[PDB]
């Protein structure tokens, strides 16, 4: 899609995704989402990548070059970015990250005021302006320039949200966390600590170079060994930007997105919160997932791969829960994109409310 692929604008930093390119992105995107209101409120967040700082600087320079009010967030998951953009009625939100990809890669992703990916018309116009070799866009000066209000506390807002979506504190549960050395590094260890659970950490020590480095949802074997080492009740593996979640049972086995979807949707049906008792998923789901869904009387709608179609279906039909085998789970009751920590909280809700271990809950769904 020229510049705006599935996951926004992506490339290897500096060489492909150049700071000049990020500057043009910020400027033209801020202009396109400015049209109606005089001084948009774009807020921006990133993962822990060493290229994040450079791309954030270029993006904020661009956004201020057309008068947009910029709210820096620091390191925060893409779910947190969406939640803050919605809960603050802001015109747009930006996440500089490239989920689970190696540290050398990075990417810019946009969210509208509703908390969803920018409309394809807006992206089309942004790309239209990136082709004219004349920067004929307004250049405000003096007081007309952009404004900046750093909001590094925003995380704790998004934290206070996640904290309230727990049916009770998880006292007496030993949980191991693998945060991929990513955005959730500071968040998750705080969250489950405020929910009274003995957390055991790994991949929570980012340095801008070690993101998704043998850790995270894509490399859960380290967490698989770590769970058995600390004899924890379960392990949680988020990815770089904290939008996926991969669980690990007390036995050390991996619990992919299909099993977590089954477990959480079954629990939500047990609470009656599952809307119409249907679950949205992709082609990538396993046969036994649908088998167990039928076994528990849960209808299901399947869409093409990619979460934009999952959210399209949940949108039009008003469905409560959706997800992918990747671990990217959307609970539209609470958020508009995939939320690793929210999914983890739902899994912990199921664990606490049923008292069963994670292996027993995940064994109800038999993979083919």
């Amino acid at each position: 899609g020229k510049y705006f692929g599935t996951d926004g604008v992506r490339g290897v930093a500096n060489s492909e995704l150049t700071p000049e390119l990020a500057f043009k992105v910020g400027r033209f995107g801020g202009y396109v989402l400015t049209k109606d209101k005089q001084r948009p409120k774009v807020l921006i967040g990133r993962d822990t990548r060493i290229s994040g700082h450079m791309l954030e600087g270029a993006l904020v320079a661009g956004l201020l070059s057309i008068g947009a009010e910029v709210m820096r967030l620091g390191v925060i998951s893409t779910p947190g970015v969406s939640y803050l953009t919605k809960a603050m009625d802001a015109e747009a939100g930006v996440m500089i990250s490239a989920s689970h990809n190696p540290v050398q890669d990075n990417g810019i992703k946009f969210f509208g005021g509703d908390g969803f990916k920018l409309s394809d018309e807006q992206e089309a116009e942004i790309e239209r302006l990136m082709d004219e070799p004349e920067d004929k866009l307004p250049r405000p000066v003096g007081a007309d320039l952009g404004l900046v209000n750093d909001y590094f506390e925003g995380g704790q807002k998004y934290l206070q949200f996640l904290k309230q979506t727990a049916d009770e504190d998880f006292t007496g549960i030993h949980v191991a966390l693998d945060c991929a050395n990513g955005a959730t590094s500071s968040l998750a260890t705080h969250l489950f600590a405020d929910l009274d659970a003995d957390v055991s950490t790994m991949g929570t020590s980012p340095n801008g170079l070690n993101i998704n480095d043998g850790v995270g949802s894509t490399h859960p074997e380290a967490l698989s060994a770590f769970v058995k080492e600390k004899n924890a009740d379960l392990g949680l593996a988020f990815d770089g930007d904290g939008d996926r979640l991969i669980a690990v049972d007390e036995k050390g086995n991996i619990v992919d997105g299909d099993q977590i979807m089954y477990i959480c949707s079954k629990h939500l049906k047990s609470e009656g919160r599952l809307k119409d008792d249907t679950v949205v998923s992709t082609v990538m789901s396993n046969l036994g997932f649908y088998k167990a869904l039928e076994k528990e009387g849960i209808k299901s709608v399947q869409t093409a791969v990619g979460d934009r179609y999952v959210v399209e279906a949940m949108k039009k039909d008003g469905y409560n829960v959706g997800g992918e085998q990747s671990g990217h789970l959307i609970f539209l009751d609470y958020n508009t994109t995939g939320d690793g920590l929210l999914s983890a909280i739902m899994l912990m809700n199921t664990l606490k409310a049923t008292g069963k271990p994670l292996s027993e809950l995940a064994a109800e769904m038999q993979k083919f």
Partner: protein
């Protein structure tokens, strides 16, 4: 005489939490003794400054759910519990924080500033009346309750 220095801190803190979406509830004592309500929170007796107030009303934090009461140019206590106003006349806008603010204005002469967690608009309660949607300089001019 040098109370303007304190108003500067209060206005900067309130404009900071308002520019974002940080709930706030600041009471300020004047003539009525508020010790009964001061002794319900975490005592501080701290020098004011904007940074301390902003830190007080941060999410997740311990002494943020409730109201801080300002006494003789010092933050006497935080996370204090204020009585809610049984009067009708306003409820339609949720309340809770605004209800607790309005409740203390019938019983005391205190001037209570509020920041909405949903809107970010600055509100003030005095003599039982709650003024909504204040501007940055309207509150500043409003804060001339000091002689």
């Amino acid at each position: 005489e040098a109370q303007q220095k304190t108003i500067e801190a209060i206005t900067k803190a309130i404009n900071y939490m308002a520019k974002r979406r940080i709930g706030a509830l600041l009471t300020i004592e004047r003539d009525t003794g508020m010790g009964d309500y001061i002794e319900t929170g975490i005592p501080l007796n701290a020098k004011v400054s904007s940074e301390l107030l902003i830190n007080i009303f941060i999410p997740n934090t311990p002494l943020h759910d409730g109201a801080v009461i300002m006494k003789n140019n010092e933050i006497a206590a935080a996370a204090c519990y204020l009585p809610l106003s049984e009067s009708p006349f306003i409820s339609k806008e949720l309340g809770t924080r605004h209800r607790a603010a309005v409740g203390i204005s019938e019983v005391t002469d205190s001037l209570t500033i509020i920041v909405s967690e949903e809107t970010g608009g600055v509100s003030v309660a005095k003599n039982g009346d709650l003024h909504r949607e204040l501007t940055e300089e309207a509150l500043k001019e409003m804060l001339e309750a000091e002689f």
